[PDB]
Design a protein around this nucleic acid. Structure first.
Ligand code: MG
Length: 102
RNA sequence: AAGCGAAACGCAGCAGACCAGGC
DNA sequence: TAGTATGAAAGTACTTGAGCTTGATC
DNA sequence: GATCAAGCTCAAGTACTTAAGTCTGGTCTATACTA
């Protein structure tokens, strides 16, 4: 239940909460705040209803949702697997605002 | 002197080059 | 992909090596 | 009587600045990386 930051992609230098750690040592499940415009980027809370209304590449499974290139989001935050080497697990130290967000 | 129906409402800048021209 | 990252200037003032006076020595 | 050394004087460099006044108009201005 540590915190990491992605290296590539738009989520670069963004705090992510390690939700589940896969024993395979290949990818780890991470909770991010989506930096998306909803197919219409500052961090903002996920709007499943908004993305459903906008349509496009979207799959609705209640609280779970898949959109825009297999991007997964459980509840209102992206819940996606990311490579072990694509994130930094040492020297993150999130602030109180980050703790409140996650 | 006269006399009629007696609520709420005046923006904003790059900057820095280089050229031509003016007395 | 999607985004971060890589040939027609001249002047003075100051420092340097060469030559030379007076010294301390011989 | 002579010498070499210290150090003062001179002509050869180097380091550094400065180069009229104001005004108008016009164009033009990064993309490599490497994931
Ligand atoms: Mg004139």
């Amino acid at each position: 239940k540590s915190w990491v930051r992605l290296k590539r992609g738009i989520y670069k230098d963004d705090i992510a909460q390690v939700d589940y750690v896969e024993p395979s040592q290949n990818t780890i499940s991470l909770k991010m705040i989506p930096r998306i415009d909803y197919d219409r980027p500052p961090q903002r809370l996920f709007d499943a209803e908004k993305i459903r209304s906008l349509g496009g590449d979207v799959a609705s499974d209640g609280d779970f949702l898949i959109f825009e290139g297999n991007r997964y989001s459980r509840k209102g935050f992206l819940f996606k697997s990311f490579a072990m080497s694509a994130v930094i697990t040492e020297g993150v130290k999130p602030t109180l605002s980050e703790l409140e967000k996650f």
